[PDB]
């Protein structure tokens, strides 16, 4: 196939000007889509705060106006999903992945409104859910929307504009341009066959998306953790150990989300009214725990700078880790709309800080900072559970800007993904697609 290759080589990277321009417009909208979405989640979280002030005397009435407010917004978001778009539940990265395998539809006329307003209810109630899910699915659909509207033809355009949608989606969610592109490249594309996703174009959409976000967000970063200490060569072995610890935890955590989907499905059976009521109680438990014990609730981005700085005790870290494991399962496995990425950063940090603590006390000759162990453990639940480690690394590299820690971050991450493989575990997004594609047939 030599004369064919010589021909193909000379024709490499000639993306059609039409997809390059349409990549620009998809990114722009997904940036605005995300920006609007973030600002809207923030405004609800504020309103919820301003309510606990008007009622700050009567602590029982306080705990009551805190539970109901998060339940009402949660139910509103559960209902918006079952009634009008049932595949905008949970994260939604499984669906956009399916859409690229051409096994699942992109119902953009339904989910764009369902995910945005439904997410605003669940995220803005302070449930344990990420902006990733929503902005990545919203942005995938926005990519379809413009494919239809301009009726571009070809596989290239469908797969590309679908892809640069999800990419611009994840970049604008974490101010993470590289992490978006690397999410498509390592995790989102169809994994068992060739594809025509133009990468030059996924880049143009990511650029545009991230500029939109910078237009409404500058001067403040999502995670400010400062510049930590370096890691000396004789320390590396301790990071490879930490990864091993994650690689056995990753797959255990996968099992729990899947079974909790089942365990919570038994609660409503399928019934659009039991289900919504359940997420009212779930969201309401979150709105309560957000007043009485904040670090056990919310997206988790708030407690990461605190945990890195060693400002929690080892006893608090154990508490938070158990509780947050619980409320991540209650909130993500229920199917409420919203991602799992962001709370897997939290879980990974808290566990990483605690291991840093013990390593400090066992080895003073090493001159450790426990913060460097949290920063290696931020991308480690990503790597051990959803098995996209090169994305967690470049995500965590981008959000915390401690390049000097690249080696122990890589090293922890391969340890987590190698022990996840070898202890018999499955990439979380793919084992959700499979159970979804395996019922979209078992009905026959």
């Amino acid at each position, epitope marked *: 196939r030599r004369r064919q290759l010589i021909r193909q080589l000379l024709e490499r990277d000639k993306t059609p000007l039409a997809i390059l321009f349409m990549a620009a417009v998809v990114g722009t909208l997904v940036g605005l889509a995300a920006v609007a979405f973030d600002k809207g989640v923030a405004w609800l979280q504020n309103q919820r705060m301003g309510a606990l002030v008007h009622t700050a005397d009567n602590y029982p009435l306080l705990l009551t106006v805190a539970f109901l407010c998060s339940a009402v917004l949660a139910m509103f978001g559960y209902f918006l999903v079952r009634k009008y778009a049932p595949e905008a539940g949970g994260s939604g990265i499984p669906e956009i992945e399916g859409a690229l395998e051409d096994q699942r539809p992109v119902r953009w006329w339904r989910v764009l409104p369902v995910k945005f307003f439904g997410g605003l209810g669940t995220l803005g109630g302070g449930m344990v859910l990420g902006r990733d899910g929503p902005t990545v699915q919203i942005g995938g659909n926005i990519g379809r929307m413009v494919l239809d509207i301009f009726r571009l033809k070809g596989d290239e355009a469908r797969h590309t504009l679908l892809a640069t949608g999800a990419a611009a989606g994840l970049a604008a969610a974490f101010n993470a341009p590289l992490a978006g592109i690397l999410f498509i490249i390592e995790e989102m594309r169809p994994q068992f066959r060739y594809t025509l996703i133009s990468i030059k174009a996924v880049f143009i959409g990511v650029i545009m998306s991230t500029i939109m976000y910078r237009i409404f967000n500058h001067e403040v970063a999502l995670i400010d953790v400062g510049k930590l*200490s370096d890691a000396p060569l*004789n320390t590396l072995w301790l990071y490879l150990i930490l990864g091993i610890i994650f690689g056995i935890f990753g797959p255990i955590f996968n099992k729990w989300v899947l079974g909790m989907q089942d365990l919570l499905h038994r609660v409503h059976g399928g019934n659009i009214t039991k289900w919504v009521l359940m997420g009212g109680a779930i969201g309401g438990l979150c709105g309560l725990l957000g007043f009485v014990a904040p670090a056990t609730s919310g997206g988790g981005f708030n407690l990461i700078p605190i945990a890195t700085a060693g400002n929690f005790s080892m006893g608090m870290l154990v508490f938070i880790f158990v509780a947050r494991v619980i409320t991540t399962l209650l909130c993500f496995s229920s199917g409420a709309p919203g991602g799992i990425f962001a709370p897997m950063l939290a879980l990974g940090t808290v566990l990483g800080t605690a291991f840093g603590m013990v390593a400090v006390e066992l080895f*003073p*000759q090493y*001159h450790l900072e426990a913060g460097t162990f949290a920063i290696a453990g931020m991308g480690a639940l990503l790597a051990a559970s959803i098995r996209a480690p090169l994305t967690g690394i470049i995500l965590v590299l981008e959000m915390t800007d401690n390049y000097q820690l690249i080696l122990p971050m890589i090293i922890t991450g391969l340890g987590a993904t190698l022990l996840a493989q070898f202890t018999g575990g499955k990439p979380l997004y793919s084992a959700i697609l499979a159970r979804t594609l395996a019922k979209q047939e078992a009905e026959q």
Partner: antibody
Amino acid sequence: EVRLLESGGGLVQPGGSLKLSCAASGFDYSRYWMSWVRQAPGKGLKWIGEINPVSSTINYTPSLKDKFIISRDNAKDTLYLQISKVRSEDTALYYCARLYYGYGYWYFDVWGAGTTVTVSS
Amino acid sequence: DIVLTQSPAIMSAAPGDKVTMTCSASSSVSYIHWYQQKSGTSPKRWIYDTSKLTSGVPVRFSGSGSGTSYSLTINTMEAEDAATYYCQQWSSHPQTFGGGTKLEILR
């Protein structure tokens, strides 16, 4: 140049106290751990303690509750050592040292000139 | 804690002649360092991580060893090589220096 200039050491009475002081010039004094080493007359180099740049971990040699108090003033580019209940054991040349590492086994990167503490009635 | 005993507590050797002191540890020890103290001057870091010469340290100097025994060495001693050489360890905690080895000219 990189210069460590410690001062404060003189004549003190047994059971008294003194506060030594090391003045760092010519490098980013933050980001480094700092340490104190003392050398009793015609004897070996002995380690007192160390302090980490955010003052969050401070270790001292197996010796006594409030004997030593290491602290640092990152804003003033200066490192401090307080010795209490001073015995004649503590008559020594005191060194201020910056710490670094190679393969990760820490060494005493740059020492200063010293100051002498004389403890006598 | 880990006690370090340097071997020729004092010694002399002519210029252009081959000098060798020893550092010996009560337990097992990794990556020793060596400091050179002249009379009236701050100790200088001389060799680190068992073997590595600091920037400036003339190449005649050299370290070696493993586990519980190490050493310093001068292929061709010079005049300005006369000083005390302190070995030092931090493989274990806390760290410990050696008693000293005084090097004087012979004449």
